[PDB]
Amino acid sequence: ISGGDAIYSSTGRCSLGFNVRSGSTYYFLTAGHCTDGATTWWANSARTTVLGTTSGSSFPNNDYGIVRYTNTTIPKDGTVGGQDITSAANATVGMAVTRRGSTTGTHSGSVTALNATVNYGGGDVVYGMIRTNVCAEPGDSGGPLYSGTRAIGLTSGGSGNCSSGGTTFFQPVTEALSAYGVSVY
């Protein structure tokens, strides 16, 4: 399993962000709004292949969560689809980026602003987000935003769609790596 692949909770489907590790403990990052209230995660809709259990969740304010792998046999590629990821980096305005998600697949675009505030309503406000002109659709939440071999962010939300075009906001991955003391590989 790799960045962008589907992940299922008891409530719905999101996308795997990046596979990360600490010492010899493997985890995966995804959106906080997906880990919120989720305990167990599966690799399929049939819930027959277990992935692991939620170890942390930060949403709203931020939008990241982490799941500890409990499945011993499943491959945990340090890639996004086939694309190798070797480091994490800070987003900059004008940066060319790529997103991969379980519903829409791979779409590209540019970072158009930083430190954006996104109000999802009902008090769910997230801050410090990366704004881009990349589309995203339901199911894409938590998927990776990368640039070349660099991990940049995790899909949080936005508006529009891939047919007409849209705006998507991402949580900077560096903040998540730091919070959990993990790193990409």
Partner: protein, 51 residues
């Protein structure tokens, strides 16, 4: 599902489908409610889950 608080400028992108009266499966409640607003209240909920 109550769309009275919409529209909203942005939606999170988790997948929990709803079936609209237009036979389109909407990816989540936020996407569905924004479309209801966009239709000026003409779109309604058919059932929960995929169409």
């Amino acid at each position: 599902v109550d769309c009275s608080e919409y529209p909203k400028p942005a939606c999170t992108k988790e997948y929990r489908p709803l079936c609209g009266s237009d036979n389109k499966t909407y990816g989540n409640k936020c996407n569905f409610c924004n479309a209801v607003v966009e239709s000026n209240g003409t779109l309604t909920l058919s059932h929960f889950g995929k169409c």
